[PDB]
Amino acid sequence: ELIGTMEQIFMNVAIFEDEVFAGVTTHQELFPHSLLSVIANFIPFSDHNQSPRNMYQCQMGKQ
Amino acid sequence: GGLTCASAPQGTLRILEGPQQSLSGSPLQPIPASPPPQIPPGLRPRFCAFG
C-alpha cells in the first residue's frame, strides 16, 4: 500500500518482523532503513555514530 | 383530484452493498526480517610474514 502523512497517524506500522502482532500492526515498513534519506543511506554504520555527526556527514558529503 | 399528504411512514430502510473480511494471515515479507551479514566459508589467510 501507499500511505500519506495524515493517514499514517491512525495505523501501526512495524519495522522489523517479530515486531508484528495480531491485532496491532495493521501495516509493516518495506525496509528497516526506509526512514533515512538517499544521502543518509550512503553513510556507513550510521547506527553506531552519535546523531549530530550524521548531520555533519550529510552536509560534508555535498562539499 | 389533487395530491394530498398520506400517512407518515412507519419505518425506513437504508441499503448499502458490503463485502466481508478474510482470515488474518499477516504475511509480512517475501524474504522476511533483516537477514544477517555472514562469514564466507573457509576464507583462508591471504597474507604471510617474511622469513
Curated annotation (Swiss-Prot), chain A:
Cellular localisation: Nucleus, Nucleolus; Chromosome
Name the UniProt record assigns to this protein: DNA-directed RNA polymerase I subunit RPA2
Disease: Treacher Collins syndrome 4: A form of Treacher Collins syndrome, a disorder of craniofacial development. Treacher Collins syndrome is characterized by a combination of bilateral downward slanting of the palpebral fissures, colobomas of the lower eyelids with a paucity of eyelashes medial to the defect, hypoplasia of the facial bones, cleft palate, malformation of the external ears, atresia of the external auditory canals, and bilateral conductive hearing loss. TCS4 inheritance pattern is autosomal dominant.
Free-text note regarding domains: The active site comprises the fork loops, the loops and the rudder that stabilize the transcription bubble and assist polymerase translocation.
Quaternary structure and partners: Component of the RNA polymerase I (Pol I) complex consisting of 13 subunits: a ten-subunit catalytic core composed of POLR1A/RPA1, POLR1B/RPA2, POLR1C/RPAC1, POLR1D/RPAC2, POLR1H/RPA12, POLR2E/RPABC1, POLR2F/RPABC2, POLR2H/RPABC3, POLR2K/RPABC4 and POLR2L/RPABC5; a mobile stalk subunit POLR1F/RPA43 protruding from the core and additional subunits homologous to general transcription factors POLR1E/RPA49 and POLR1G/RPA34. Part of Pol I pre-initiation complex (PIC), in which Pol I core assembles with RRN3 and promoter-bound UTBF and SL1/TIF-IB complex.
UniProt organism field: Homo sapiens (Human)
Site (Active site gating): 56
Family: Belongs to the RNA polymerase beta chain family.
Biological role stated in the UniProt entry: Catalytic core component of RNA polymerase I (Pol I), a DNA-dependent RNA polymerase which synthesizes ribosomal RNA precursors using the four ribonucleoside triphosphates as substrates. Transcribes 47S pre-rRNAs from multicopy rRNA gene clusters, giving rise to 5.8S, 18S and 28S ribosomal RNAs. Pol I-mediated transcription cycle proceeds through transcription initiation, transcription elongation and transcription termination stages.
From Swiss-Prot, chain B:
Subcellular location: Nucleus, Nucleolus; Chromosome
Region (Disordered): 18-41
Bias kind Pro residues: ranges: 29-41
Sites of Phosphoserine modification: 26, 34
Family according to the record: Belongs to the eukaryotic RPA34 RNA polymerase subunit family.
Misc: It is in an antisense orientation to and overlaps the gene of the DNA repair enzyme ERCC1. This gene overlap is conserved in mouse, suggesting an important biological function.
Subunit structure: Component of the RNA polymerase I (Pol I) complex consisting of 13 subunits: a ten-subunit catalytic core composed of POLR1A/RPA1, POLR1B/RPA2, POLR1C/RPAC1, POLR1D/RPAC2, POLR1H/RPA12, POLR2E/RPABC1, POLR2F/RPABC2, POLR2H/RPABC3, POLR2K/RPABC4 and POLR2L/RPABC5; a mobile stalk subunit POLR1F/RPA43 protruding from the core and additional subunits homologous to general transcription factors POLR1E/RPA49 and POLR1G/RPA34. Forms a heterodimer with POLR1E/RPA49. Part of Pol I pre-initiation complex (PIC), in which Pol I core assembles with RRN3 and promoter-bound UTBF and SL1/TIF-IB complex.
Name this protein carries in UniProt: DNA-directed RNA polymerase I subunit RPA34
Entire protein: shown range: 103 to 153 of 510
